[PDB]
């Protein structure tokens, strides 16, 4: 029993974290095989970050300008190239701790674990979701740029995020491992604002199934709804539309608990129009939207890595 | 900026997780140097779960009765001893991934990361607090016994918990790494109930200071209170008494935010009386009590 946020074990990723220093800027890099990946803004100064020409700044750099440190060992950079907003530093040594890995771009609503680092040293691990507005509600201080988000699939690490910046509202923005930003963001000091966020509906439904599996049933009701009537209500409360794919994905949880997806939707609809009435679900007074249907199944069944 | 419930990186602990099998029971063990630690109830049969005599069951066991598996490699048990509720299996190979470590017993209110394992394989990492009633609100299934709780404060792993059992209310009970249970619990299937839980007051105050550091000030008020008047109110809401030690511990946060501890205590009294009124603090509609003052300073 019990339901907790829970991140993937971070060991496979910790063996990849290195410190990347260029001039006065020090941030984190991901060392996989003979390449170190990090945000390209490491090559920037204060004048540069206002309006940067990364191709021009990078062409003026030499390999010895990048100081890469793996533990107490300095790696030597033998090449440098840029792919979108990520900088690739070729090193002479392949990381002996390189796990089986893949670079994957995730969709809003999908979850991943963040290994927060400072000076190439992992300090914490937390689970979060790619918000529908493409920000993440992370926890990051200065020097955490280059910290990565990942998932584990069997013995394979899927790297899906690298931290680049913090928006004025305290939310975070970053890229996949190919340097492509999640969201309408750019890697420079300029006026940027995250769009109005929405609730990840399929994730709330998955978390309601997790609550039923844990014995919390007070919110269940006799009612069912059409997908169209539910979505008309969902749109109204700033909730993401629920697609037929989401309904299909909730299938195993629906089969396990005996509560059809549209029946759980009718519980969610009443919960939105009426509230919790001083009650809690899994110790929470708010509907949790950072557990996907796969996360709920994995945790309420014990899949290991 | 931002505030998250955050576990320590689990890598140093993952390299220590092994599978321990005795008869039909299979659970997790912690392999440090040439010793594998695990709950002593791994030696228990169906007949010996209500009133097991562990000294008697252990004396009937031999080293070849314990099957230890580290990855796909079977370790050879060359000795067995019991320390309180923990079983120590001496092995013929020292763990090459053994980190710098210590065994520490924690106090209620203290937080730690849990590496949940099944069959010696880590499946997830999460954050816990030792509840005032000495239980933990974990997320554990059958097979998770021997999963450990730890803190990694600079380089060294402090092992503070080993999972042993689930109580009828879905909460969890376990021991430190010397086999001493946290709480009035025994490793028997006898009728056991956790005491009524209470909110860890000092941790709620630390989390209110974290919210002020992050710019959330709506709950602040112009009131202060005496420690005694605060404790009289807080206890009516099943909150733990706040001692002078707790007030002293909140000192750096008080100095950083400019809000005296007794002033923040008055904001806490107001919150308990009014509720949140549809507002949230750090994205939460409830008062969070699983961030200690040390956690808040570290994360901020
Ligand atoms: C009654 N019983 C069963 C096996 C084991 C037990 O509770 N272990 C389990 C661990 N973590 C979550 C669980 C979730 C569902 C079931 C078991 C769980 C145990 C251990 C002791 Cl020391 C005494 C009794 C006892
Ligand atoms: Cl949690």
Coordinates of C-alpha atoms and ligand atoms in Angstrom, one line a residue:
Chain A
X1 CA 0.0 0.0 0.0
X2 CA 0.8 3.7 -0.2
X3 CA 1.3 6.1 -3.1
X4 CA 4.2 8.4 -3.4
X5 CA 5.6 10.7 -6.1
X6 CA 8.6 8.4 -6.8
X7 CA 11.4 9.0 -9.3
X8 CA 13.3 6.4 -11.3
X9 CA 16.6 5.2 -9.6
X10 CA 19.2 7.8 -10.7
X11 CA 22.4 5.7 -10.6
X12 CA 22.7 5.2 -14.4
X13 CA 22.4 9.0 -14.9
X14 CA 24.8 9.9 -11.9
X15 CA 27.7 8.1 -13.7
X16 CA 27.2 10.5 -16.6
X17 CA 27.2 13.9 -14.8
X18 CA 30.2 16.1 -15.4
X19 CA 31.1 19.8 -14.7
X20 CA 31.5 22.0 -17.8
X21 CA 33.3 25.4 -17.5
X22 CA 33.7 28.0 -20.2
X23 CA 35.2 31.3 -19.1
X24 CA 33.3 32.3 -15.9
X25 CA 30.2 30.1 -16.5
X26 CA 30.1 26.7 -14.8
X27 CA 27.2 24.3 -15.4
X28 CA 26.5 20.5 -15.9
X29 CA 27.2 18.2 -18.8
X30 CA 26.0 14.8 -19.7
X31 CA 28.9 12.5 -20.6
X32 CA 27.8 9.6 -22.9
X33 CA 30.5 7.6 -24.9
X34 CA 33.1 10.3 -26.0
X35 CA 30.6 13.2 -26.1
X36 CA 29.6 15.7 -23.4
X37 CA 26.3 17.4 -24.0
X38 CA 25.4 20.7 -22.2
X39 CA 23.3 24.0 -22.9
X40 CA 25.0 26.1 -25.5
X41 CA 24.5 29.3 -23.3
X42 CA 27.7 28.1 -21.4
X43 CA 29.7 30.1 -24.1
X44 CA 27.8 33.3 -23.2
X45 CA 28.7 36.4 -21.1
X46 CA 26.2 39.2 -19.9
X47 CA 26.4 41.2 -23.1
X48 CA 26.1 38.0 -25.2
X49 CA 23.0 36.6 -23.4
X50 CA 21.0 39.7 -24.3
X51 CA 21.2 39.1 -28.1
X52 CA 23.5 36.1 -28.8
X53 CA 24.9 34.8 -32.1
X54 CA 25.9 31.3 -31.0
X55 CA 27.5 30.3 -34.3
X56 CA 29.8 33.4 -34.0
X57 CA 30.6 32.9 -30.3
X58 CA 31.3 29.2 -30.9
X59 CA 33.6 29.8 -33.9
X60 CA 35.8 32.0 -31.6
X61 CA 36.2 29.2 -29.1
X62 CA 38.9 26.5 -29.0
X63 CA 38.8 23.1 -27.4
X64 CA 41.1 24.2 -24.5
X65 CA 38.5 27.0 -23.6
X66 CA 36.2 24.2 -22.3
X67 CA 37.2 22.7 -19.0
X68 CA 35.4 19.4 -18.4
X69 CA 35.6 17.7 -15.1
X70 CA 34.5 14.1 -14.4
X71 CA 34.9 13.7 -10.6
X72 CA 38.4 14.9 -9.8
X73 CA 39.7 14.1 -13.3
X74 CA 39.9 16.7 -16.1
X75 CA 38.7 15.4 -19.5
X76 CA 40.3 16.9 -22.6
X77 CA 38.0 18.3 -25.2
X78 CA 39.1 17.3 -28.8
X79 CA 36.1 18.8 -30.7
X80 CA 33.1 21.1 -30.4
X81 CA 29.9 21.3 -32.4
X82 CA 26.4 22.7 -31.7
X83 CA 23.1 21.0 -32.4
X84 CA 20.2 23.5 -31.9
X85 CA 20.5 24.8 -28.3
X86 CA 22.8 22.0 -27.1
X87 CA 26.6 22.1 -27.2
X88 CA 28.5 18.8 -28.0
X89 CA 32.0 18.6 -26.6
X90 CA 33.9 15.7 -28.1
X91 CA 36.3 14.2 -25.5
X92 CA 39.3 11.8 -25.8
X93 CA 37.9 9.3 -23.2
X94 CA 34.7 7.3 -23.6
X95 CA 32.6 7.2 -20.3
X96 CA 33.1 3.7 -19.0
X97 CA 29.8 4.2 -17.0
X98 CA 27.8 4.9 -20.1
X99 CA 24.5 3.0 -19.8
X100 CA 22.2 1.7 -22.6
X101 CA 20.6 5.0 -23.6
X102 CA 18.4 6.8 -26.1
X103 CA 17.4 10.4 -26.8
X104 CA 13.6 10.7 -26.8
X105 CA 11.4 13.8 -27.1
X106 CA 8.4 13.6 -24.8
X107 CA 4.8 15.0 -25.1
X108 CA 3.1 17.3 -22.6
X109 CA 1.6 15.3 -19.8
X110 CA 4.4 12.7 -19.9
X111 CA 6.5 12.4 -16.7
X112 CA 10.2 12.0 -16.1
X113 CA 12.7 12.1 -13.3
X114 CA 15.1 15.0 -12.8
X115 CA 18.6 14.6 -11.5
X116 CA 19.4 18.1 -10.2
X117 CA 23.2 18.8 -10.3
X118 CA 25.5 21.6 -9.3
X119 CA 29.1 21.6 -10.5
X120 CA 28.7 18.2 -12.1
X121 CA 27.6 16.7 -8.7
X122 CA 24.1 15.2 -8.4
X123 CA 22.3 16.7 -5.4
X124 CA 18.7 15.5 -5.7
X125 CA 16.2 13.5 -7.7
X126 CA 12.5 14.4 -8.2
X127 CA 9.6 13.3 -10.4
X128 CA 7.8 15.8 -12.6
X129 CA 5.6 16.3 -15.6
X130 CA 6.1 18.2 -18.9
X131 CA 3.2 20.7 -18.4
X132 CA 0.8 21.3 -21.3
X133 CA 2.3 24.8 -21.6
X134 CA 5.8 23.1 -22.0
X135 CA 7.3 24.3 -18.8
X136 CA 8.2 22.0 -15.9
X137 CA 7.6 23.0 -12.3
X138 CA 11.1 22.1 -11.1
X139 CA 13.3 23.1 -8.2
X140 CA 16.5 24.6 -9.5
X141 CA 19.0 27.2 -8.2
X142 CA 21.9 28.9 -10.1
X143 CA 24.3 26.3 -11.6
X144 CA 21.7 23.7 -12.2
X145 CA 21.7 24.2 -16.1
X146 CA 22.5 21.0 -17.8
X147 CA 20.7 18.9 -15.2
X148 CA 18.8 16.1 -17.1
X149 CA 15.3 14.6 -17.1
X150 CA 15.0 10.9 -17.9
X151 CA 12.9 7.7 -17.8
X152 CA 14.1 4.1 -17.5
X153 CA 12.8 1.4 -19.8
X154 CA 14.1 -2.1 -18.7
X155 CA 17.9 -1.3 -18.6
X156 CA 17.7 1.6 -21.1
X157 CA 17.8 5.3 -20.0
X158 CA 15.7 7.6 -22.2
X159 CA 17.1 11.1 -21.9
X160 CA 14.2 13.5 -22.5
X161 CA 15.2 16.8 -21.0
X162 CA 18.1 19.2 -20.3
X163 CA 17.6 22.3 -18.1
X164 CA 18.3 25.7 -19.7
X165 CA 16.5 28.4 -17.8
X166 CA 14.0 29.7 -15.3
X167 CA 11.1 31.9 -16.4
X168 CA 9.9 35.0 -14.3
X169 CA 7.1 32.9 -12.7
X170 CA 9.6 30.5 -11.1
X171 CA 8.8 27.7 -13.7
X172 CA 11.5 26.0 -15.8
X173 CA 12.2 25.7 -19.5
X174 CA 14.6 23.4 -21.4
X175 CA 15.2 21.2 -24.4
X176 CA 15.3 17.5 -25.5
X177 CA 18.9 16.1 -25.9
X178 CA 18.9 17.3 -29.6
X179 CA 18.8 20.9 -28.3
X180 CA 15.1 21.5 -29.4
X181 CA 13.3 23.5 -26.8
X182 CA 10.1 22.3 -25.3
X183 CA 7.7 25.2 -25.7
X184 CA 7.9 28.6 -27.4
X185 CA 11.1 29.5 -25.6
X186 CA 14.5 30.8 -26.6
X187 CA 17.8 30.6 -24.8
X188 CA 18.4 34.3 -24.1
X189 CA 17.7 37.1 -21.6
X190 CA 14.5 38.6 -23.0
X191 CA 10.8 39.0 -22.0
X192 CA 9.4 35.4 -22.0
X193 CA 6.3 34.1 -20.4
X194 CA 4.8 30.7 -20.1
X195 CA 1.3 30.3 -21.4
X196 CA -1.7 29.7 -19.1
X197 CA -1.3 26.1 -17.8
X198 CA -3.9 23.4 -17.9
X199 CA -4.5 20.3 -15.9
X200 CA -3.4 17.0 -17.4
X201 CA -6.8 15.2 -17.4
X202 CA -5.6 11.6 -18.3
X203 CA -3.0 11.8 -15.4
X204 CA -5.7 12.9 -12.9
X205 CA -7.9 9.9 -14.0
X206 CA -4.8 7.6 -13.6
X207 CA -4.3 9.1 -10.0
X208 CA -8.0 8.5 -9.2
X209 CA -7.5 4.8 -10.2
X210 CA -4.4 4.7 -7.9
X211 CA -6.6 6.0 -5.1
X212 CA -9.2 3.3 -5.7
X213 CA -6.5 0.7 -5.7
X214 CA -5.4 2.1 -2.3
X215 CA -9.0 1.9 -1.0
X216 CA -10.1 5.5 -1.3
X217 CA -13.6 5.3 -2.9
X218 CA -15.6 8.2 -1.5
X219 CA -15.6 10.1 -4.8
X220 CA -16.9 7.2 -6.9
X221 CA -20.5 7.6 -8.1
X222 CA -23.1 5.7 -10.0
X223 CA -22.9 7.9 -13.0
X224 CA -21.2 7.7 -16.4
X225 CA -20.8 10.3 -19.1
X226 CA -20.1 10.6 -22.9
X227 CA -16.5 11.6 -23.9
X228 CA -18.0 14.7 -25.6
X229 CA -20.0 15.8 -22.4
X230 CA -16.9 15.2 -20.3
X231 CA -14.7 17.3 -22.6
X232 CA -17.2 20.2 -22.6
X233 CA -16.9 20.3 -18.8
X234 CA -13.1 19.7 -18.9
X235 CA -12.5 22.7 -21.3
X236 CA -14.5 24.9 -18.9
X237 CA -12.2 24.1 -15.9
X238 CA -8.9 24.5 -17.8
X239 CA -8.5 20.8 -18.1
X240 CA -6.8 19.2 -21.2
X241 CA -9.2 17.3 -23.6
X242 CA -9.4 13.6 -23.1
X243 CA -8.9 11.7 -26.3
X244 CA -9.9 8.1 -27.3
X245 CA -6.2 7.2 -26.9
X246 CA -6.3 8.4 -23.3
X247 CA -9.4 6.3 -22.7
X248 CA -7.7 3.2 -24.3
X249 CA -4.5 3.9 -22.2
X250 CA -6.6 3.8 -19.0
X251 CA -8.0 0.4 -20.0
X252 CA -5.9 -1.9 -17.7
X253 CA -6.7 0.4 -14.7
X254 CA -10.4 0.4 -15.6
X255 CA -10.3 -3.4 -15.9
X256 CA -8.4 -3.8 -12.6
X257 CA -10.7 -1.6 -10.5
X258 CA -14.0 -2.3 -12.2
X259 CA -14.6 1.4 -12.9
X260 CA -15.1 2.3 -16.6
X261 CA -13.1 5.3 -17.8
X262 CA -16.3 7.3 -18.6
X263 CA -17.6 6.3 -15.1
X264 CA -14.4 7.7 -13.5
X265 CA -14.8 10.8 -15.7
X266 CA -18.3 11.3 -14.2
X267 CA -16.6 11.2 -10.7
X268 CA -14.0 13.8 -12.0
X269 CA -16.8 16.0 -13.5
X270 CA -18.6 16.1 -10.1
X271 CA -15.3 16.7 -8.3
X272 CA -14.7 19.8 -10.5
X273 CA -18.2 21.2 -10.2
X274 CA -18.5 20.5 -6.4
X275 CA -15.0 20.2 -5.0
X276 CA -13.6 17.8 -2.3
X277 CA -15.9 19.1 0.5
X278 CA -13.1 19.0 3.1
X279 CA -12.1 15.5 2.0
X280 CA -8.8 14.3 0.6
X281 CA -7.7 11.7 -2.0
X282 CA -4.4 10.0 -1.3
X283 CA -3.7 12.6 1.4
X284 CA -4.1 15.4 -1.1
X285 CA -6.8 18.2 -1.2
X286 CA -6.1 18.9 -4.9
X287 CA -6.3 16.6 -7.9
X288 CA -2.8 15.3 -8.7
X289 CA -1.8 15.4 -12.4
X290 CA 1.8 14.3 -12.4
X291 CA 1.3 10.5 -12.4
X292 CA 0.7 9.1 -15.9
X293 CA -1.3 5.9 -16.4
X294 CA 2.0 4.0 -16.9
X295 CA 3.4 5.4 -13.6
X296 CA 0.3 4.3 -11.7
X297 CA 0.6 0.7 -13.1
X298 CA 4.4 0.6 -12.5
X299 CA 4.0 1.7 -8.9
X300 CA 0.9 -0.3 -8.1
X301 CA 2.5 -3.5 -9.5
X302 CA 6.3 -3.2 -8.7
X303 CA 8.2 -3.0 -12.0
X304 CA 12.0 -2.9 -11.2
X305 CA 15.1 -1.3 -12.9
Chain B
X1 CA 13.4 29.0 -7.4
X2 CA 10.7 26.3 -7.1
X3 CA 10.1 23.8 -4.3
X4 CA 9.8 20.1 -4.8
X5 CA 9.8 17.0 -2.6
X6 CA 13.2 15.8 -3.5
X7 CA 15.0 12.5 -2.8
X8 CA 18.8 12.0 -2.6
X9 CA 20.4 10.5 -5.8
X10 CA 20.1 6.7 -5.3
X11 CA 23.2 5.5 -7.2
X12 CA 25.3 4.9 -4.1
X13 CA 22.5 2.7 -2.6
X14 CA 21.6 0.9 -5.8
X15 CA 25.1 -0.6 -6.0
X16 CA 24.4 -2.2 -2.6
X17 CA 21.0 -3.9 -3.3
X18 CA 21.0 -7.7 -3.4
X19 CA 18.3 -10.4 -3.3
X20 CA 18.2 -12.6 -0.2
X21 CA 16.3 -15.9 -0.3
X22 CA 15.8 -18.3 2.5
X23 CA 13.5 -21.2 1.8
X24 CA 10.4 -19.8 0.1
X25 CA 10.9 -16.2 1.3
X26 CA 12.6 -13.7 -1.0
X27 CA 13.4 -10.1 0.1
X28 CA 16.1 -7.4 -0.3
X29 CA 19.5 -7.1 1.4
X30 CA 22.0 -4.3 1.7
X31 CA 25.5 -5.5 0.7
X32 CA 28.2 -3.3 2.4
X33 CA 31.8 -4.6 2.4
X34 CA 31.6 -8.4 3.1
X35 CA 28.2 -8.2 5.0
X36 CA 24.6 -8.4 3.7
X37 CA 22.0 -6.9 6.1
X38 CA 18.3 -7.9 5.8
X39 CA 15.2 -8.3 8.0
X40 CA 15.5 -11.4 10.2
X41 CA 11.9 -12.4 9.3
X42 CA 13.4 -13.9 6.0
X43 CA 14.1 -17.1 8.1
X44 CA 10.4 -17.3 9.1
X45 CA 8.0 -20.1 7.9
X46 CA 4.1 -20.0 7.9
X47 CA 4.1 -21.6 11.5
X48 CA 6.7 -19.1 12.8
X49 CA 5.1 -15.8 11.9
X50 CA 2.9 -15.1 15.0
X51 CA 5.4 -16.0 17.7
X52 CA 8.7 -16.7 16.1
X53 CA 11.8 -17.6 18.2
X54 CA 14.4 -16.1 16.0
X55 CA 17.4 -17.4 18.0
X56 CA 16.0 -20.9 17.7
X57 CA 15.1 -20.7 14.0
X58 CA 18.6 -19.1 13.2
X59 CA 20.5 -21.8 15.1
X60 CA 18.8 -24.5 12.8
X61 CA 20.1 -22.6 9.7
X62 CA 23.3 -23.2 7.8
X63 CA 25.1 -20.8 5.4
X64 CA 24.0 -22.8 2.4
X65 CA 20.3 -22.2 3.3
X66 CA 20.8 -18.4 2.4
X67 CA 20.9 -17.7 -1.4
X68 CA 22.3 -14.2 -2.0
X69 CA 22.1 -12.8 -5.5
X70 CA 24.0 -9.6 -6.6
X71 CA 22.9 -9.0 -10.2
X72 CA 23.2 -12.3 -12.0
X73 CA 26.0 -13.5 -9.6
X74 CA 25.3 -15.7 -6.6
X75 CA 27.3 -14.7 -3.5
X76 CA 28.5 -17.4 -1.1
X77 CA 27.4 -17.0 2.6
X78 CA 30.3 -17.9 4.9
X79 CA 28.6 -16.7 8.2
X80 CA 25.4 -15.7 9.8
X81 CA 24.6 -13.6 12.9
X82 CA 21.6 -11.6 14.2
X83 CA 21.7 -8.2 15.7
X84 CA 18.3 -7.3 17.1
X85 CA 15.7 -7.6 14.2
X86 CA 18.4 -7.6 11.4
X87 CA 20.1 -10.6 10.0
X88 CA 23.8 -10.3 9.0
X89 CA 25.0 -12.6 6.3
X90 CA 28.8 -12.7 6.0
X91 CA 29.8 -13.2 2.3
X92 CA 33.1 -14.2 0.6
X93 CA 33.2 -11.1 -1.6
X94 CA 33.4 -7.5 -0.5
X95 CA 31.0 -5.2 -2.5
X96 CA 33.3 -3.2 -4.8
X97 CA 30.6 -0.5 -5.1
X98 CA 30.5 0.0 -1.3
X99 CA 30.2 3.7 -0.7
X100 CA 31.5 5.7 2.3
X101 CA 28.7 4.9 4.8
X102 CA 27.4 5.1 8.4
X103 CA 24.5 3.7 10.3
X104 CA 22.5 6.5 11.9
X105 CA 19.2 6.2 14.0
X106 CA 16.9 9.1 13.3
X107 CA 14.3 11.0 15.4
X108 CA 10.6 11.5 14.4
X109 CA 10.2 14.4 12.1
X110 CA 13.5 13.5 10.3
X111 CA 13.3 13.0 6.5
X112 CA 15.1 10.4 4.3
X113 CA 14.9 8.9 0.8
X114 CA 13.6 5.4 0.2
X115 CA 15.0 3.1 -2.5
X116 CA 12.1 0.7 -3.0
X117 CA 13.4 -2.7 -4.3
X118 CA 11.9 -6.0 -5.4
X119 CA 14.1 -9.1 -5.8
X120 CA 17.2 -7.1 -5.2
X121 CA 16.3 -4.7 -8.0
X122 CA 15.7 -1.0 -7.4
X123 CA 12.4 0.1 -8.9
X124 CA 11.8 3.6 -7.4
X125 CA 13.1 6.4 -5.2
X126 CA 10.9 8.6 -3.0
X127 CA 11.0 10.9 0.0
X128 CA 9.7 10.1 3.5
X129 CA 9.5 11.5 7.0
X130 CA 9.7 9.3 10.2
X131 CA 6.2 10.1 11.6
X132 CA 5.8 11.2 15.2
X133 CA 4.0 7.7 15.8
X134 CA 7.3 6.0 14.4
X135 CA 5.7 4.7 11.2
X136 CA 6.5 5.9 7.7
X137 CA 3.9 6.5 5.0
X138 CA 5.7 4.6 2.3
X139 CA 4.7 3.0 -1.0
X140 CA 5.5 -0.7 -0.6
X141 CA 4.3 -4.0 -2.1
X142 CA 5.0 -7.6 -1.1
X143 CA 8.7 -8.2 -1.6
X144 CA 9.9 -4.7 -0.6
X145 CA 11.2 -6.0 2.8
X146 CA 14.8 -4.9 3.2
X147 CA 14.4 -1.7 1.1
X148 CA 16.4 1.0 2.8
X149 CA 15.9 4.7 3.8
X150 CA 19.0 7.0 3.6
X151 CA 20.4 10.5 3.5
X152 CA 23.4 11.4 1.4
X153 CA 24.8 14.4 3.1
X154 CA 28.1 15.1 1.2
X155 CA 29.9 11.9 -0.1
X156 CA 28.7 9.6 2.7
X157 CA 25.5 7.6 2.8
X158 CA 23.8 7.5 6.2
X159 CA 21.6 4.4 6.3
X160 CA 18.7 5.1 8.7
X161 CA 16.0 2.7 7.9
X162 CA 15.2 -0.8 6.7
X163 CA 11.7 -1.8 5.8
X164 CA 10.2 -4.8 7.7
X165 CA 6.4 -4.7 7.7
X166 CA 3.1 -3.0 6.8
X167 CA 0.6 -2.3 9.5
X168 CA -3.2 -2.8 9.0
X169 CA -3.7 0.9 8.2
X170 CA -1.3 0.8 5.2
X171 CA 1.5 2.5 7.0
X172 CA 5.0 1.0 7.4
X173 CA 7.3 -0.1 10.2
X174 CA 10.9 -0.9 10.2
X175 CA 14.3 -0.6 12.0
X176 CA 17.6 1.3 11.9
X177 CA 20.5 -0.7 10.5
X178 CA 21.3 -2.2 13.9
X179 CA 17.9 -4.0 13.9
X180 CA 16.2 -1.7 16.5
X181 CA 12.7 -1.0 15.5
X182 CA 11.4 2.5 15.3
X183 CA 8.3 2.6 17.5
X184 CA 6.6 0.0 19.7
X185 CA 6.6 -2.6 16.9
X186 CA 7.7 -6.2 16.8
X187 CA 8.6 -8.4 13.8
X188 CA 5.6 -10.7 14.5
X189 CA 2.2 -11.0 12.8
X190 CA 0.6 -10.1 16.2
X191 CA -2.2 -7.5 16.5
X192 CA -0.3 -4.2 16.1
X193 CA -1.6 -0.7 15.6
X194 CA 0.2 2.6 15.0
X195 CA -0.6 5.4 17.5
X196 CA -2.7 8.4 16.3
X197 CA -0.4 10.3 14.0
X198 CA 0.3 14.0 14.5
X199 CA 1.6 16.8 12.2
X200 CA 5.3 17.6 12.5
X201 CA 5.0 21.3 13.5
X202 CA 8.7 22.3 13.1
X203 CA 8.6 20.9 9.5
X204 CA 5.4 22.8 8.6
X205 CA 7.1 26.0 9.9
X206 CA 10.2 25.3 7.8
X207 CA 8.0 24.8 4.8
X208 CA 6.2 28.1 5.5
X209 CA 9.7 29.8 5.5
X210 CA 10.4 28.0 2.1
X211 CA 7.2 29.5 0.8
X212 CA 8.2 33.0 1.9
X213 CA 11.7 32.6 0.3
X214 CA 9.8 31.6 -2.9
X215 CA 7.6 34.8 -2.7
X216 CA 4.4 33.3 -1.3
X217 CA 3.4 35.7 1.5
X218 CA -0.4 35.7 1.6
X219 CA -0.6 33.7 4.9
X220 CA 1.7 36.1 6.8
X221 CA 0.0 38.2 9.5
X222 CA 0.9 41.1 11.9
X223 CA 0.6 38.8 14.9
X224 CA 3.1 37.1 17.1
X225 CA 2.4 34.5 19.9
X226 CA 4.0 33.0 23.0
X227 CA 5.4 29.5 22.6
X228 CA 2.9 28.2 25.2
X229 CA -0.2 29.8 23.5
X230 CA 1.0 28.4 20.1
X231 CA 1.3 24.9 21.6
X232 CA -2.1 25.1 23.2
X233 CA -3.7 25.9 19.8
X234 CA -1.5 23.6 17.7
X235 CA -2.3 20.5 19.8
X236 CA -6.1 21.0 19.3
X237 CA -5.3 20.4 15.6
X238 CA -3.2 17.2 16.4
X239 CA 0.0 19.1 15.9
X240 CA 3.2 18.1 17.7
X241 CA 4.4 20.5 20.4
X242 CA 7.1 22.9 19.3
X243 CA 10.0 22.9 21.7
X244 CA 12.6 25.6 22.3
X245 CA 15.0 23.4 20.3
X246 CA 12.7 23.6 17.3
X247 CA 12.5 27.4 17.7
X248 CA 16.3 27.6 17.8
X249 CA 16.6 25.3 14.7
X250 CA 14.3 27.7 12.7
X251 CA 16.7 30.5 13.6
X252 CA 18.6 30.7 10.2
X253 CA 15.3 30.7 8.3
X254 CA 13.9 33.4 10.6
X255 CA 17.1 35.5 10.1
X256 CA 16.9 35.0 6.3
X257 CA 13.3 36.0 5.8
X258 CA 13.0 38.6 8.6
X259 CA 10.0 36.8 10.2
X260 CA 10.5 35.7 13.8
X261 CA 9.6 32.1 14.7
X262 CA 6.8 33.2 17.0
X263 CA 5.6 35.5 14.3
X264 CA 5.5 32.6 11.8
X265 CA 3.8 30.5 14.5
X266 CA 1.0 33.1 14.6
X267 CA 0.6 32.7 10.8
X268 CA 0.4 28.9 11.4
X269 CA -2.4 29.4 14.0
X270 CA -4.3 31.5 11.6
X271 CA -4.0 28.9 8.8
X272 CA -5.3 26.2 11.1
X273 CA -8.3 28.3 12.1
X274 CA -9.2 29.5 8.6
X275 CA -8.0 27.0 6.2
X276 CA -6.6 28.1 2.8
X277 CA -9.7 29.7 1.4
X278 CA -9.1 28.2 -2.1
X279 CA -5.5 29.4 -2.0
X280 CA -2.3 27.2 -2.1
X281 CA 1.2 27.5 -0.6
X282 CA 3.9 26.1 -2.8
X283 CA 1.3 24.5 -5.1
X284 CA -0.2 22.6 -2.1
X285 CA -3.7 23.0 -0.6
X286 CA -2.5 21.3 2.7
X287 CA 0.3 22.1 5.1
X288 CA 3.4 20.0 4.2
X289 CA 5.2 18.4 7.1
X290 CA 7.9 16.3 5.3
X291 CA 10.5 19.1 4.8
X292 CA 12.7 19.6 7.8
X293 CA 14.4 22.9 8.5
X294 CA 17.7 21.3 7.2
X295 CA 15.9 20.2 3.9
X296 CA 14.5 23.8 3.3
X297 CA 17.9 25.4 3.7
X298 CA 19.5 22.8 1.4
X299 CA 16.9 23.1 -1.3
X300 CA 16.7 26.9 -1.1
Ligands
LIG1 C1 1.8 -10.0 8.2 N1 3.0 -9.9 7.5 C2 3.0 -10.2 6.1 C3 4.4 -10.2 5.4 C4 5.2 -9.0 6.0 C5 4.7 -7.7 5.5 O1 3.8 -7.1 6.0 N2 5.5 -7.1 4.5 C6 5.1 -6.1 3.5 C7 6.0 -5.1 3.3 N3 5.6 -3.9 2.7 C8 4.4 -3.8 2.2 C9 3.4 -4.8 2.2 C10 2.2 -4.8 1.6 C11 1.3 -5.8 1.6 C12 1.7 -7.0 2.2 C13 2.9 -7.1 2.9 C14 3.8 -6.0 2.9 C15 5.3 -9.1 7.5 C16 6.5 -8.8 8.2 C17 6.5 -8.8 9.5 CL1 7.9 -8.3 10.4 C18 5.4 -9.2 10.3 C19 4.2 -9.6 9.6 C20 4.2 -9.5 8.2
LIG2 CL1 5.4 12.4 -2.2

